[PDB]
Amino acid sequence: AIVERIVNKLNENQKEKIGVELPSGKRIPEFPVSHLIRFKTWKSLDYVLKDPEMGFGEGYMNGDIEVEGDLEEVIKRGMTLFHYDLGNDFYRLWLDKSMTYSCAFFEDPSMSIDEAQSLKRRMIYEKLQLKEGDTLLDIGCGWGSIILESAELYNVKSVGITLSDNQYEYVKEEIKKRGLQDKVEVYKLHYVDLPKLGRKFNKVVSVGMFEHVGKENYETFFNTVYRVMEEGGLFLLHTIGKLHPDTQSRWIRKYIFPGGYLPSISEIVESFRDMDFTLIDFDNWRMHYYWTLKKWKERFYENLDKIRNMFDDRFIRMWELYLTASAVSFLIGSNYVFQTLLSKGVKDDYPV
């Protein structure tokens, strides 16, 4: 009844029809469809009707909702209309070789994730005008690809901070393996404690970390960055964001990223309203994250047998929904990726 209206809305002007199978086994529509959503319990259907995001996410995770066909198409049409220990050995199965956990840059969708992450890093180095003698700080350095490669390519002295023990030990070992002990440092450190390093930097980068800061902490974040920068330095901030302030994902917060906040352009910029930062450039990479998440999901499926041997079926459904729904959010224009290049003080000689 209400179910038939929703199915009708989902199929308006669509070649590939979506259908629903009720717990009784009854189909709506009672004709062949391209994508079938099966509800095993009336409770799971009730949940979706009342709360599509949490109802579908938890119902899919728990196995009450099955999808025959293309999960991305189903998630796209629906979103348009409407504890596990994760070790380095899990991430290595679907991130690229450099273990970069952030948006890549694709000259073309056929580009490999490794090439696209290497290009993304090169574009960041170029934006920062990196040169020998610079001091580079990476706030939220993950598995270290930027602090390691910048030192090897440009002979900068680089420092990364991360909150993850697993990342810290991995980067420590990479520094040793590559003989970079005199050029690269890494610390397990919250950004608020950056002044304790007792150092300033003329180049600062932060990629995929700002989403975890929380809106109530933005002024503290930009004040901290300002205070550890040399006058005339450059700060490249790369974050997922929104075009306008909007609702945050309860499902992502519950299962993937507690305490995350995706800010709008206005929320980012007004965070540093009382500070001597000048805007150099603002870059939008939205569709590149769609392609990044598509490549991650492809590699995830390539290694699905091992991942299942490491985690249960509920985890796999959770992770595949995370990668799929996240990709869709960029595809349909709900989320963006923004790169903001700021100077400390008014810089008038940035190249054209």
Ligand X SMILES: Nc1ncnc2c1ncn2[C@@H]1O[C@H](CSCC[C@H](N)C(=O)O)[C@@H](O)[C@H]1O
Ligand Y SMILES: CCCCCCCCCCCCCCCC(=O)OC[C@@H](COP(=O)(O)CCN)OC(=O)CCCCCCCCCCCCCCC
Binding site for ligand Y (CB under 6 A): 3, 6, 20, 37, 48, 52-53, 56-57, 74-75, 78-79, 101, 208, 211, 240, 248-249, 251-252, 257, 260, 262, 321, 325-326, 329, 334-335
Q: How far is the CB of 169 from ligand X (least distance, A)?
A: 13
Whether 28 contacts 1, CB under 8 Å: no
For residues 292 and 278, what is the distance between their CA atoms, to the nearest angstrom? 30
Q: What does 248 bind: ligand Y, ligand X, none (CB cut-off 5 to 8 Å by kind)?
A: ligand Y
CB nearer to ligand Y: give 37 or 175.
37
Q: What does 325 bind: ligand Y, ligand X, none (CB cut-off 5 to 8 Å by kind)?
A: ligand Y
Q: How is residue 346 written in tokens?
A: 């008014």
Residue 311's contacts (CB-CB under 8 Å, 6 or more residues apart) are 84, 90
CB nearer to ligand X: give 98 or 249.
98
Cis peptide bond upstream of 263, omega within 30: no
For residues 297 and 319, what is the distance between their CA atoms, to the nearest angstrom? 9
**234: closest CA among 125, 312, 153, 154?**
125
Task: Tell me how far CA of residue 329 lies from CA of 122, 236, 283, 332, in angstroms.
Answer: 26, 24, 18, 6
**Residue stretches of the annotated binding site for S-adenosyl-L-homocysteine:** 101-102, 142, 163, 191
- The number of CA neighbours under 13 Å toward the Cβ of 127 is 24
Q: What does 56 bind: ligand X, ligand Y, none (CB cut-off 5 to 8 Å by kind)?
A: ligand Y
**167: closest CA among 139, 187, 183, 151?**
187
CB nearer to ligand X: give 130 or 141.
141
CB nearer to ligand X: give 73 or 91.
91
**Residue stretches of the annotated binding site:** 101-102, 142, 162-163, 191
Q: How far is the CB of 305 from ligand X (least distance, A)?
A: 26
Q: How far is the CB of 74 from ligand X (least distance, A)?
A: 28
CB nearer to ligand Y: give 118 or 324.
324
CB nearer to ligand X: give 87 or 333.
87
Q: What does 240 bind: ligand Y, ligand X, none (CB cut-off 5 to 8 Å by kind)?
A: ligand Y
Q: How far is the CB of 20 from ligand X (least distance, A)?
A: 37
Q: What does 220 bind: ligand Y, ligand X, none (CB cut-off 5 to 8 Å by kind)?
A: none
Q: How far is the CB of 91 from ligand X (least distance, A)?
A: 10
The residues with which 28 forms a beta bridge, in sequence order, are 20
**Which positions touch ligand X (CB under 6 A)?**
100-102, 139-142, 161-164, 167, 190-191, 207-209, 212
Which helix (H) or strand (E) covers residue 188, if one does? strand 184-188
Amino acid (one-letter) located at 56? F
Angle between the 286-302 and 113-127 helix axes, to the nearest 10 degrees? 140
Q: What does 229 bind: ligand X, ligand Y, none (CB cut-off 5 to 8 Å by kind)?
A: none
Q: Could you say which DSSP state residue 214 is in?
A: -
Q: How is residue 275 written in tokens?
A: 């500070």
